[PDB]
Design a protein around this ligand. Structure first.
Ligand SMILES: [Cl-]
Ligand SMILES: [Cl-]
Length: 162
């Protein structure tokens, strides 16, 4: 298992525009198109992202390519962030993957606000962090995915994914 496979599981793969759990226009592997309500705006954003006239549909390859860009961007978001980097720098490989997941789902800024959980992770207070991470909208809205990530922070293994 690795970050790719791990998110591929959390997000799924869809080749037609779709609405996410919050009702936003998305495509591929959890690639957010726009927060606008307009299906056109989404179509527009999509052809711009793909470089061609898509008409709301894309191929696997295309999907996969947005997916690489997206993971890359997430990582780099993390390294550029004064609140995240250290956390990330302190952890092992598996747990790092967990952090990136959060970041992919919710943005660097969203994640940078889990101050206290971040302090805990950094200190390696596993169980405590996992409790704290659960007192979040995030857990309450997407609880099964959130349990998966959480456990991953707790155990440093991929069990939740096997
Ligand atoms: Cl893009
Ligand atoms: Cl979920």
């Amino acid at each position: 298992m690795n970050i790719f496979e791990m998110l591929r599981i959390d997000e799924g793969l869809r080749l037609k525009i779709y609405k996410d759990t919050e009702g936003y226009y998305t495509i591929g592997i959890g690639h957010l198109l726009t927060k606008s309500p307009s299906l056109n705006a989404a179509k527009s954003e999509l052809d711009k992202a793909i470089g061609r006239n898509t008409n709301g549909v894309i191929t696997k390859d295309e999907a996969e390519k947005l997916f690489n860009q997206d993971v890359d961007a997430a990582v780099r978001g993390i390294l550029r962030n004064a609140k995240l980097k250290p956390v990330y720098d302190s952890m092992d490989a598996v747990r790092r993957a967990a952090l990136i997941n959060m970041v992919f789902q919710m943005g660097e800024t969203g994640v940078a606000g889990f101050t206290n959980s971040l302090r805990m992770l950094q200190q390696k207070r596993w169980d405590e962090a996992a409790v704290n991470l659960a007192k979040s909208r995030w857990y309450n809205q997407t609880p099964n995915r959130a349990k998966r990530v959480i456990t991953t922070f707790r155990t440093g293994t991929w069990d939740a994914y096997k």
